[PDB]
């Protein structure tokens, strides 16, 4: 399983780096910010499911609460396929900066890949202007 | 790629089968009754993209209109997995038969194939709704 060509998409909040921790790391509010979960998001068994669609089929698996502001989660595909996605808010001054670690996955072409990044942008633009309202 | 284990998911909608195609048919309607797009799909050269979310970006490819009521769709996973869905609506009596055959994939675990079949249930049970009121 190779080392991935990644970029690292990334924003700023104007809220302290608790707060922010305190509303992204609640998976039950997942569904209001990232656009793909706005089917909505239940608790299946320690971790998540989101059901519905078109891929009817995607689990998701948090990391456990901490103090250093992580909130990665392993997505599983329909197929099987985990895919690690890291997630962190860190303190910026008095705000946060938000962070996304996107991984290319095999085969994928420049297009995809930017559409991902665009996709992932948009959930944490939406994330900033939740917590900024 | 084996034969798959399946499950033709169905339910009657009560209003003629031309109209309840014409919107089922519709891209643009679906993020009204199918959950998984509930956040949006965007047309994308001929093809729709539903971002993001967990899994980013997905692919979906429609059958082009036809006089049988098919509304098949092909979805691609970010890892590249194509999935074939086949979606009909019939004629039944003055109403309509609507169906979706649900293929198990490989590296699906019961409780997967059963939430699956669950979430697909309650798309088309709102599709019911909607066209019904």
Redesign the interface.
Known sequence: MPVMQSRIIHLSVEKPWAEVYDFAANPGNMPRW???????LEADGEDW????????????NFAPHNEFGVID?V?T?????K?Y?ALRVTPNGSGTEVSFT?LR????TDE?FE??????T??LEMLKSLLEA
């Open positions: 990232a656009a793909g979960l706005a089917g909505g499911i989101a059901k519905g669609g078109p891929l009817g089929e995607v689990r998701v989660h997505v595909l329909p197929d099987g396929l895919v996605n996107l996955l095999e085969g994928m995809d559409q991902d990044a665009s996709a992932i948009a959930d």
